[PDB]
Design a protein around this ligand. Structure first.
Ligand SMILES: O=C(O)[C@H]1O[C@@H](O[C@H]2[C@H](O)[C@@H](NS(=O)(=O)O)[C@@H](O[C@H]3[C@H](O)[C@@H](O)[C@H](O[C@H]4[C@H](O)[C@@H](NS(=O)(=O)O)[C@@H](O[C@H]5[C@H](O)[C@@H](O)[C@H](O[C@H]6[C@H](O)[C@@H](NS(=O)(=O)O)[C@@H](O[C@H]7[C@H](O)[C@@H](O)[C@H](O)O[C@@H]7C(=O)O)O[C@@H]6CO)O[C@@H]5C(=O)O)O[C@@H]4CO)O[C@@H]3C(=O)O)O[C@@H]2CO)[C@H](O)[C@@H](O)[C@@H]1O
Ligand SMILES: O=C(O)[C@H]1O[C@@H](O[C@H]2[C@H](O)[C@@H](NS(=O)(=O)O)[C@@H](O[C@H]3[C@H](O)[C@@H](O)[C@H](O[C@H]4[C@H](O)[C@@H](NS(=O)(=O)O)[C@@H](O[C@H]5[C@H](O)[C@@H](O)[C@H](O[C@H]6[C@H](O)[C@@H](NS(=O)(=O)O)[C@@H](O[C@H]7[C@H](O)[C@@H](O)[C@H](O)O[C@@H]7C(=O)O)O[C@@H]6CO)O[C@@H]5C(=O)O)O[C@@H]4CO)O[C@@H]3C(=O)O)O[C@@H]2CO)[C@H](O)[C@@H](O)[C@@H]1O
Ligand SMILES: *[C@@H]1O[C@H](CO)[C@@H](O[C@@H]2O[C@H](CO)[C@@H](O[C@@H]3O[C@H](CO[C@H]4O[C@H](CO)[C@@H](O)[C@H](O)[C@@H]4O)[C@@H](O)[C@H](O[C@H]4O[C@H](CO)[C@@H](O)[C@H](O)[C@@H]4O[C@@H]4O[C@H](CO)[C@@H](O)[C@H](O)[C@H]4NC(C)=O)[C@@H]3O)[C@H](O)[C@H]2NC(C)=O)[C@H](O)[C@H]1NC(C)=O
Ligand SMILES: *[C@@H]1O[C@H](CO)[C@@H](O[C@@H]2O[C@H](CO)[C@@H](O[C@@H]3O[C@H](CO[C@H]4O[C@H](CO)[C@@H](O)[C@H](O)[C@@H]4O[C@@H]4O[C@H](CO)[C@@H](O)[C@H](O)[C@H]4NC(C)=O)[C@@H](O)[C@H](O)[C@@H]3O)[C@H](O)[C@H]2NC(C)=O)[C@H](O)[C@H]1NC(C)=O
Ligand SMILES: *[C@@H]1O[C@H](CO)[C@@H](O[C@@H]2O[C@H](CO)[C@@H](O[C@@H]3O[C@H](CO[C@H]4O[C@H](CO)[C@@H](O)[C@H](O)[C@@H]4O)[C@@H](O)[C@H](O[C@H]4O[C@H](CO)[C@@H](O)[C@H](O)[C@@H]4O)[C@@H]3O)[C@H](O)[C@H]2NC(C)=O)[C@H](O)[C@H]1NC(C)=O
Ligand SMILES: *[C@@H]1O[C@H](CO)[C@@H](O[C@@H]2O[C@H](CO)[C@@H](O[C@@H]3O[C@H](CO[C@H]4O[C@H](CO)[C@@H](O)[C@H](O)[C@@H]4O)[C@@H](O)[C@H](O[C@H]4O[C@H](CO)[C@@H](O)[C@H](O)[C@@H]4O)[C@@H]3O)[C@H](O)[C@H]2NC(C)=O)[C@H](O)[C@H]1NC(C)=O
Ligand SMILES: *[C@@H]1O[C@H](CO)[C@@H](O[C@@H]2O[C@H](CO)[C@@H](O)[C@H](O)[C@H]2NC(C)=O)[C@H](O)[C@H]1NC(C)=O
Ligand SMILES: *[C@@H]1O[C@H](CO)[C@@H](O)[C@H](O)[C@H]1NC(C)=O
Ligand SMILES: [Ca+2]
Ligand SMILES: [Ca+2]
Lengths: 516, 512
């Protein structure tokens, strides 16, 4: 019985080269992979090779506990927003990501900002507490080389009381055409730098980094202007704004280095493998005050509050976060001009704001969340987010298009937001959220089957709205769909959610609905 | 060819044995076939072996002409209704198939009867004319008759039929009178018959089952079918007035030998290889004894006549069996109507009218639109999708089911009628067709999975998994849309035909 080449005719159209042993035919995975759109590779173990086949990529989140508004946000403990190449950088002034997804010019995308917040919130609950190293308090610390300041000629420093802040602070005076005053740091493990800052004049706070790229030094300059980001090797510049009143500056030096070096005029940051291996020293220029200089493994809550604060300050009078970029969802849909709202933005923002409220009891956050339900009440053409499927089912549009698009995953995020709010706001204040949630959940249960292909899910209902082919959801949207339904199945006991979760999971392993 | 056997882990769940050459891994088709639900086999040609892979089974009809109401019915020239194992037999009395699909007791299913008619109509237009061999006219045509003692035969005039006929008298406790036939090529027997008493006309067949003789008895009672040893019995009814009896001896033999108490006929390989002789018992008359390759028009008119005689006062063909479409749908009690039955019946009746100009057929067709006007709950066939789109239900369930293929057959019927009845008489059909076609265009995308079609909308109506259409229903869907695309110029039909065809070859809608 010979093992030999055999011609394999595919659908009477093309011949590939297979192999035959007796009656058994073997087909090349090169063909299988492309023809069925599946995944595989040879994995090398110690003394053992194994081919490993997968129907899909992407994994379902292993939910540990029922969903609650003050817990982790779905699967976002595993999200890494800032490494996404559509994140140009973390704004120095705002402390939140700028997106370039639909425009190289860059814009604050509320969805991305909410996800930044919610992922950092979730990581705060799941990760080990950070190591925190304190380099300067200007107190009676009063050892451990906290006074390793270099003060060149023409510069001055002092420990001085700040009555307003009930603490001692480090005063510094250093002209910009000088070396500046310099604090030796030397951290090789942790790369989140933090310091309380108040400038009297223009100036900068700079951090020198040893990197993994051939031992070479890069400096990151945090400058008292509004310029976003600049890179002229080996110097990276972020404007952090005037900082003429006390604030805590928190920066991730890994992200700030990678986004600097990777700076691009395109919609995508250049890939780089560069990492900082040592935080060498901090340089202060101009006239001002410093306190509480620290380096931490992580600073999740600072990120979360930067997102929350941004959402409060940037909400408009209609309760919305307008998206200031043109969105063309596809042929047959009208272009959305800048200033459109997204049900996904509203929902993700509400989930952020509700968590901010529950932590602080600061009603400013809750009130912003309550205002954010207003766009759910108005049709897309009335500058809202509401669509109605076949004059029967209310829907909250990720993309408020004409005709309506009915994107599934944005809708479910819009509902989770409403849930967080209605559970938190109390009976009287939460009435509108409760009503929108109940109507929305009724729609979801009725319409879920329209998104099921029998071997996957559809992203939206454009096939029906425009009379074209289904827009099939790629596997990472399919797992998003599962993660969302899995979450909803813990706050609503409807059997339909559990049955759909189970079937949609089976699709990841190549199961199919039965044919007749 | 050198290789290495290599373990192939499938979805982290089970391991199969593959083969590796360099970076290339080859997977066993044994696995591919089952895992992806695909088809393949090694075909041996002279000096060339080739593995031949198919994503699907089932082929799209190669349309040769735009659709017309008096032409072939879609792809039905290729249909073979009578070999289907859910056809218990061709009724002796009625000359149409009896179904056992949803009950072993058997029932006349109007859809199956219409398809019998429409397939034979279509074959009539596409096949070569049959060879017809005439054995007895009782004229001055040319005896091959054996008349045992105690039997009698004569040539006698029949004034009513303007012909001479063969009189026969033969007691049942005798061999009967026998005409030698001897046909080895053709197996459709035909004869004009009139009994004076009870009796039988029997046909002896030489068969492929160890050269054995089997006899098929056409008996003057209403008993459906019986099989004992090498004798098969069909009741053909009293036959006390002249009628033409036409029987397919291949089918009649296979259904006899395959006789079962289940919903499916037993498979058999048995075939007749010779029509030996015809035996007459009792008192009666015979004329025009013939054997033909085919008799398509006799089959077509048996179906048409049955439809005329069995239509009720509401214009419907009631289906006299319980239908349970699935969990979530109320059972349909016997007497329900089907939009597919109404449509297929209309398509049959319209063709019968255009051949004969007999207005009885057109009148029956016109009456058959009435159930399309009434909701399922009012004992009609109409459903309304989301208070917007009229639909004609193959299965008029509660809740509504929206079976695609039945709906399209219901529309083709309305089309046949509106085109044939003229402007005034065809008004109701035209209105129902136009509304229906609007619905079809709007709702087609709901049946598209991106790699196939769904059979119905039960997933949405009941909140469950999609009921995916088998490949043979998917090709039915394509054949129907292809037909509609030749009588309606809407781009949507051409676009859907094209995409749905691509699915047969493993193409998929793009993911985002
Ligand atoms: O350690 C490791 O192994 C590595 O980890 C890597 O990160 C992992 C991470 O650990 C994983 N987390 S875990 O699974 O939980 O453990 C995992 O996280 C992913 C996750 O799988 C994704 O589901 C998730 O998606 C997010 C989006 O990131 C987010 N975007 S953002 O704006 O906030 O930045 C948001 O997406 C919605 C937004 O509205 C839009 O961005 C998005 O646009 C769609 C568009 O709607 C589509 N339109 S279409 O009409 O259907 O076509 C479509 O459009 C594009 C077409 O696809 C193209 O053909 C066309 O040319 O261009 C079109 C276009 O861009 O316009 O697609 C786009 C883009 O998706 O719509 C979104 C919507 O909701 O509809 O919210 C999503 C859902 O939550 O991102 C997670 C994440 O990155 O955190 O996987 C990642 C890896 O991928 C590390 O990166 C690595 O360093 C480690 O080594
Ligand atoms: O050439 C040779 O060598 C061989 O040829 C062989 O025949 C070929 C033939 O040449 C082909 N023709 S060609 O393509 O033109 O070249 C081809 O003909 C087929 C064709 O592919 C089919 O599309 C066609 O389907 C017909 C039906 O036969 C017909 N039925 S009948 O009543 O008239 O007898 C009619 O079907 C509708 C009826 O209302 C019902 O019968 C039917 O019931 C469905 C039911 O609705 C489904 N329900 S579900 O809730 O969705 O599941 C489903 O139900 C069954 C489930 O599948 C099972 O799981 C369960 O256990 O049992 C369920 C049940 O039975 O209840 O399926 C059933 C059955 O389909 O609904 C129909 C509807 O319209 O919805 O109309 C159909 C479409 O026109 O049949 C053609 C034919 O046979 O003529 O293919 C054959 C290959 O077989 C010879 O056979 C061979 O001898 C030669 O050697
Ligand atoms: C599809 O369906 C069509 C339509 O049915 C079919 O065409 C018909 O084919 C049949 C074949 O049997 C033809 O029937 C014959 O009709 C003869 C008289 O018909 C006249 O009128 C029609 C129009 O109405 C004219 O077009 C036609 O040209 C004629 O002028 C009739 O004489 C025949 O009767 C003889 O044969 C039968 C058995 O078939 C027998 O029982 C009779 O006793 C009679 O005896 C024999 O006569 C023939 C002479 O025809 C003679 O050769 C023979 O020797 C005699 N036998 C003996 C022993 O002496 C018969 O009824 C019909 O005309 C066709 N119609 C049309 C419109 O073409 C197609 O063939 C079908 N195709 C397929 C693929 O299924
Ligand atoms: C998820 O988020 C929660 C809530 O935010 C975190 O828990 C909180 O952790 C923080 C610790 O960062 C804790 O904060 C208090 O901070 C006070 C600040 O005072 C001192 O620490 C800072 C540096 O962190 C310095 O800048 C100050 O100058 C103070 O320095 C002290 O004095 C000497 C110098 O002379 C210094 O060497 C000492 O190390 C330092 N002393 C101490 C005790 O740090 C503290 O006064 C106070 O004790 C807290 O540390 C806050 O209380 C936590 N809240 C809760 C509810 O637990 C989680 O860590 C976070 N988890 C994850 C995984 O992200
Ligand atoms: C560097 O990091 C340290 C943290 O380690 C910061 O020092 C803390 O600063 C905060 C405020 O800036 C101080 O908290 C304030 O306490 C005031 C009263 O403090 C007295 O009483 C306490 C004991 O109860 C004594 O320990 C203390 O010495 C004082 O005698 C309050 O009046 C302040 O709150 C007021 O306003 C809020 C509303 O916003 C109300 O909630 C209050 O009721 C009140 O009206 C405030 O809470 C804290 O004492 C400092 N800690 C230490 C250990 O010194 C530095 O500020 C930081 N550096 C910079 C520049 O920010
Ligand atoms: C075996 O097969 C043969 C066919 O080969 C059948 O014989 C035919 O039978 C039919 C019907 O019985 C005969 O058709 C009838 O012919 C009548 C007159 O025939 C001739 O005679 C007149 C003159 O007297 C001529 O003018 C005429 O042109 C004919 O040449 C017609 O009067 C009949 O008319 C029909 O229509 C009118 C209404 O429009 C009715 O009133 C009548 O009742 C009838 O329906 C009719 O056309 C045909 O002539 C026979 N052909 C031959 C060659 O004999 C046998 O009947 C069949 N055997 C059996 C048992 O059925
Ligand atoms: C930092 O420098 C800018 C100039 O680049 C200063 O901005 C000016 O401020 C004065 C008020 O004192 C205004 O009248 C000018 O119009 C501003 N000019 C520009 C170009 O913005 C800024 O004041 C400096 N910062 C501090 C703390 O003094
Ligand atoms: C007619 O039926 C009777 C019994 O009902 C039977 O005795 C007789 O054999 C039958 N006659 C013929 C000719 O078959
Ligand atoms: Ca201090
Ligand atoms: Ca005669």
């Amino acid at each position: 019985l010979k093992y030999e080449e055999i011609d394999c005719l595919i659908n009477d159209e093309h011949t590939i080269k297979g192999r035959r042993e007796g009656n058994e035919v073997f087909l090349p995975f090169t063909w299988v992979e492309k023809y069925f759109d599946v995944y595989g590779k040879v994995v090398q173990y110690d003394g053992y090779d194994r081919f490993e086949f997968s129907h899909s990529y992407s994994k379902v989140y292993a939910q540990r506990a029922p969903y609650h508004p003050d817990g982790v946000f779905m699967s976002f403990e595993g999200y890494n927003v800032e490494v996404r190449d559509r994140v140009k950088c973390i704004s120095g002034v705002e402390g939140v990501p700028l997106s370039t997804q639909w425009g190289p010019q860059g814009y604050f995308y509320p969805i991305q900002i909410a996800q930044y917040g919610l992922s950092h919130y979730s990581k705060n609950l799941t990760e080990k507490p950070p190591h925190i190293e304190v380099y300067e308090t200007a107190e009676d610390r009063d050892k451990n080389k906290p006074n390793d300041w270099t003060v060149p000629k023409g510069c001055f420093m002092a420990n001085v009381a700040d009555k307003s802040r009930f603490t001692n602070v480090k005063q510094f005076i250093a002209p910009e055409t000088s070396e500046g005053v310099s604090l030796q740091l030397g951290n090789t493990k942790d790369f989140i730098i933090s310091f309380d800052l108040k400038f009297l004049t223009n100036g900068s706070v700079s951090v020198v980094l040893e990197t993994t790229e051939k031992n070479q030094l890069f400096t990151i300059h945090y400058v008292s202007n509004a310029q976003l980001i600049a890179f002229k090797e080996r110097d990276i510049y972020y404007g952090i704004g005037p900082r003429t009143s006390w604030s805590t500056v928190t920066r991730d030096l890994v992200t700030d280095l990678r986004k600097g070096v990777g700076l691009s005029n395109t919609k995508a940051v250049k890939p780089t493998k560069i990492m900082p291996k040592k935080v060498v020293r901090l340089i202060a220029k101009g006239k001002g005050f410093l306190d509480n200089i620290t380096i931490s493994t992580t600073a999740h809550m600072a990120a979360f509050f930067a997102a929350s604060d941004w959402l409060v300050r940037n909400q408009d009078e209609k309760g919305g976060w307008p998206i200031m970029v043109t969105r063309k969802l596809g042929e047959g849909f009208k272009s959305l001009e800048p200033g459109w709202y997204s049900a996904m933005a509203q929902g993700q923002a509400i989930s952020t704001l509700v968590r901010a409220y529950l932590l602080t009891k600061d009603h400013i956050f809750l009130n912003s969340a309550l205002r954010a339900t207003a766009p759910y009440k108005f049709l897309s053409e009335q500058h809202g987010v509401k669509a109605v499927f076949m004059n029967k089912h209310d829907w909250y549009e990720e993309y408020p298009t004409t005709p309506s698009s009915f994107v599934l995953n944005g809708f479910m995020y819009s509902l989770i937001g409403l849930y967080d709010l209605k559970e938190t706001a109390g009976e009287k204040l939460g009435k509108e959220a409760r009503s929108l949630y109940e109507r929305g959940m009724e729609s979801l249960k009725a319409m879920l089957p329209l998104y099921d292909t029998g071997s996957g899910t559809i992203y939206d209902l454009r096939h029906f709205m425009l009379g074209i082919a289904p827009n099939l959801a790629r596997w990472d949207f399919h797992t998003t769909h599962i993660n969302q339904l899995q979450l909803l199945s813990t706050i609503d006991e409807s059997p339909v959610f559990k049955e759909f979760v189970k079937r949609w999971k089976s699709y990841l392993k190549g199961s199919r609905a039965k044919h007749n």
